[PDB]
Design an enzyme around this catalytic site. Structure first.
Site, PDB file in Angstrom:
ATOM      1  N   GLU A  50      45.773 -87.633-120.748  1.00  9.29           N
ATOM      2  CA  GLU A  50      44.387 -87.190-120.614  1.00  9.29           C
ATOM      3  C   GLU A  50      44.103 -86.603-119.242  1.00  9.29           C
ATOM      4  O   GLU A  50      43.291 -85.678-119.116  1.00  9.29           O
ATOM      5  CB  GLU A  50      43.432 -88.357-120.872  1.00  9.29           C
ATOM      6  CG  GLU A  50      43.155 -88.633-122.332  1.00  9.29           C
ATOM      7  CD  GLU A  50      44.219 -89.498-122.968  1.00  9.29           C
ATOM      8  OE1 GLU A  50      45.108 -89.988-122.238  1.00  9.29           O
ATOM      9  OE2 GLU A  50      44.160 -89.694-124.197  1.00  9.29           O
ATOM     10  N   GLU A 103      46.883 -95.149-127.639  1.00 10.43           N
ATOM     11  CA  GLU A 103      45.792 -96.114-127.567  1.00 10.43           C
ATOM     12  C   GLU A 103      45.650 -96.846-128.893  1.00 10.43           C
ATOM     13  O   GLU A 103      45.597 -98.082-128.935  1.00 10.43           O
ATOM     14  CB  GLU A 103      44.494 -95.407-127.181  1.00 10.43           C
ATOM     15  CG  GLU A 103      44.436 -95.009-125.713  1.00 10.43           C
ATOM     16  CD  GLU A 103      43.360 -93.984-125.417  1.00 10.43           C
ATOM     17  OE1 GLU A 103      42.498 -94.255-124.554  1.00 10.43           O
ATOM     18  OE2 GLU A 103      43.374 -92.907-126.044  1.00 10.43           O
TER      19      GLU A 103
END
Lengths: 236, 232, 237, 230, 230, 229
Positions: free
Chosen positions: D120, D100
């Site tokens: 995640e 990210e």
């Protein structure tokens, strides 16, 4: 459960009534589903040209210990009934005859035009329970009255009379209750007098361009304009 | 620069009375620090007003390069006041002009005194409103009145401010604070999770189509339904 | 055709066709396009006043195909966009009737000042079509979706007072006092910074169509642009 | 927790190679303060310390989850909206927050040893630092959905294939390539580059007409700068 | 018109093989109600054409053409916005409404024999079931315009290089591959998976900040679930 | 000056080969005038004359605004024209030309074509829509790379990033273009240009609004004789 009755010129004015006056026309999932099927899920028949929606009983338009997962399905049923009312073919005139709180008010805000009586009190008290307005109140109320008044109403969770609702535009007009349905018909028979093709293409253009920039909305408008020009209503 | 009193609700005040509580870089940074980039969980509602009861809030000769930095500081403080966790009640006690007005427009609800006067006079000196006025005034009062106020740069009184929606209510001066208090308390008694998640939903869906806003709302609604305030 | 009179940098533009109630055909639309396009290059003019000739009206060839319908709607969109996006701020002095394309024309301007004799509306649906010159979008963006839906579905005229109540016009003054009033506001805008005024207009007309963050980017760009202008340092005295 | 080397071009290196430069709160704050910029720096290269990892306890409250996801949003936005361009020199692992963080930068140049992903969902959560949006805006909706639902690693060749990375070069020659692109950008006009960045980062979120307004405003701003006429 | 088989994962199959699994309104209704809402036992849905030859391959009343297009929009949105991830295993022909339905799904894995396209403009109409929007949102405006204006078909390799499908495998081993990826998504957290799906499907339509708000809401909402600690 | 030749498909050509078909205000104005279209033309082909190039610091800031407005106007006139446009990139496409190429619907480039946005090497960003159209065509990463670096790229990597639809040998470029222009011209005119309207409008909106545009265009096409016949 729910009532419908149709007469007008062409007699395509359909009055739709929520029939639960014992519980102030409160909206459960049954009322929501019956409303979805009455509005026929994004279309209608061709006899009807204008819809007038209200609740029987002359007192209230329409006034969860559950499964955090089930509340998503609950809010989905609410979103579905609000979208089915909001995107129906014919225009809808919400005759708010009294209390319109929580879901009810959201229902009232799904309609195109709101004619309230001098006895109508609207609000979104969900925040007094511990929840936000879950059937579109955080979006449609803003889009109708402005972010300031929407924030005030949703934060306070308070009730406001029809006069200040007209002041902030939550209702288009305010008339005495004795005249409410009368006025509700008088506007409807006016909209029914105009070309249905033009009216409903205008509705499609408005409901689609409210969510886009000016250029995309103008594209929608020109497409609907050509569509209406391919219709006999234009030339006669 | 700062004033904090928290008893229930935290009244925050711009402490520059001898200069009509004017906005500058130091006051903006102080407001940024005060709004904690969120808040502490004790406070439920915030009221932003000006000291002196004469002006809510009424160094630019330089360097367009650092004019960008000045506008960035303004945007930062306005967004920190706008996206703070607790609701914000702006009690404009008089002059809310320029950066002050924009500051007042960052909060959720504005309560006006009868002596209040608002407007964006930046167009009279050299510039457009640079702290969010050209967008926030539009999103509050509509494009027509926004254009009128920005092009003319004139001041308008509190009654016509409530006429166009820039302020939610107008009350007498001597009873402004009290009234603010009451509204704040009427918001303080409500559910913390509910109010704050609905604030998130509104501040996020104001910038998107209806469907995306409904998605935001359903997410906030589930998040609240996972909280004890819902059942109790 | 179309008349222009400028002094103060204040330019009054007049739709000159009182025999047809200043009705909107393709000729007057094209002349409006050409007049407002020249004003973009006119640096003396600071504010524009748009009104109809005479004291009566501010402002049906449809035997046509759907393709020439599209062309007519495109000409209307072009005139409305040229008036809307012109360099100088526009003040629509609605001296009477503004219905159909005339009302959409008035809605393309920045600010509307209507006379107490003015009547505004979109009667398009009474002849089978929606508003074709931006009504279905500009009316909603000016007055909100509720009143826009009401007016478009009914196709009715409304007096200047209710138009001010719903925001369709900014102010309502007596008819004989309209012209003067307009000029006054124009003067108040002409005395302001032209650089600041017009960058404000660009920022507003662009940020109305985007989220708050993109609008703030537009605003900071216009702000720096103005800070590069002598008006900024020269008037902050 | 972080290293700056301005030689000309500022190379930024996250410093925790003991477990491959994971994204805590403290490195988030250090990167936030480091991305602040100064007039000296023209291009920014951000890479990971450890030569093979760019950046590779949680059953605590949901409110702390909200505020630490807000911290991640803040660090990603501070990286994304800097004045100078950002060249993410992905030297190895870039999974979760790290990737990210890598997607926040303007341009990515990965080593042939680099593996990127969003795992995640194997833990029970979505990517909370901007993956669900920036990955989709970079590689498209189909590849983004595939990567977030699978939560798998992909090799840098597939990243260049789907556009997740701009170029792929050997690790030993990664820094020379990243600095080559850096000095290519720094040779260009600072005003033009930075106004281009502002215009792109703002118009990516708007319709074409609004974005063209952004662009014309930045274009006028660039014409007031001395870099234009010379 | 369509059948369902679940085990572990649900496979939904257009059962009109002699008609090449073409789509009319009735099979659209069947698919609409087969995607219900849903039940909690299904984790990943695989939709493919029955007969390993085609995934899925109008003379009245423009008024009723509106209703036909609305039925198409309804089926495409019910497939697109549905709870579980969807894997479109195009086993050959996907033309017109079939390809639009395939584009409604999350991930598309194509057999090497697959051929996709939007030939609507050869009839006198545009794509009416979401093609003009979903094709552009998947493959980009250039290839979308090319395919829509030409109305031509494209094999699996070109559709993969333009991103219309995520992967291309031999036909005889398509479903098996479509199974394993499904398996790979089944082992991941259903809560994280579906909240990521909601966040992506909602933030594809908004600016970056609104998408980040959606993402942080879904992130706290997955922190609501017990699967975060286990 | 510029030229046009209709045969069925109107090829439009920038006629300034001794200056590599570079863009000025006059060229942009004549391009706006040429793109006006007529009911006979079904597909448009935009290319440069000469086989060398498709199209390859005194003003104030206000006339810089005016120049950027002229560029935006010509790019929007080409982009929103009725018929689909095929940009035959026969060599250099730098700066405005690049942006011009990015305004058309489909780009077919010769193997010798070189595309780029060198504005940033002069002190300015792309001012004819590059900073938006390039990002909308090739994505944000490659657009950022190209705009920040300001570098020229060959035809094959332009195809790799999607800047051009196909790469064709230069000596055959035109023919290939014409071939595509024929394949599109045989299709429904009404359907194809309603598709173009729907795409050019829905690219700027959410999915629901774009689907509204699409359903309106679809109903429009159902009222045309091309649908049933």
């Amino acid at each position: 459960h729910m009532s419908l009755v149709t007469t007008s010129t062409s007699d395509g004015i359909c009055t739709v009534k929520i029939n639960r006056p014992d519980k102030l026309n409160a909206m459960n999932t049954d009322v929501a589903k019956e409303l979805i099927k009455t509005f026929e899920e994004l279309n209608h028949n061709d006899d009807v040209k204008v819809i007038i929606l209200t609740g029987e009983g002359e007192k209230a338009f329409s006034a969860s210990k559950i499964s955090a997962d089930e509340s998503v399905e609950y809010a989905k049923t609410g979103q579905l009934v609000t979208a089915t009312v909001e995107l129906v073919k014919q225009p809808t005139i919400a005759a708010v005859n009294g209390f319109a709180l929580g879901g009810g008010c959201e229902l009232a805000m799904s309609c195109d035009i709101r004619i309230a009586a001098d006895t109508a009190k609207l609000g979104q008290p969900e925040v007094t329970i511990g929840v936000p307005p879950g059937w579109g109140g955080t979006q449609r109320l803003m889009r109708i009255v402005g972010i300031a008044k929407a924030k005030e109403l949703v934060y306070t969770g308070k009730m406001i009379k029809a006069e200040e609702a007209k002041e902030i535009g939550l209702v288009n007009h305010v008339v005495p209750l004795a005249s409410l349905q009368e006025e509700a018909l008088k506007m409807a028979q006016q909209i029914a007098g105009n070309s249905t093709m033009g009216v409903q293409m205008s509705k499609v253009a408005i409901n689609k361009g409210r969510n886009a920039d000016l250029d995309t909305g103008l594209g929608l408008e020109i497409l609907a304009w050509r569509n209406c020009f391919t219709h006999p209503d234009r030339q006669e």
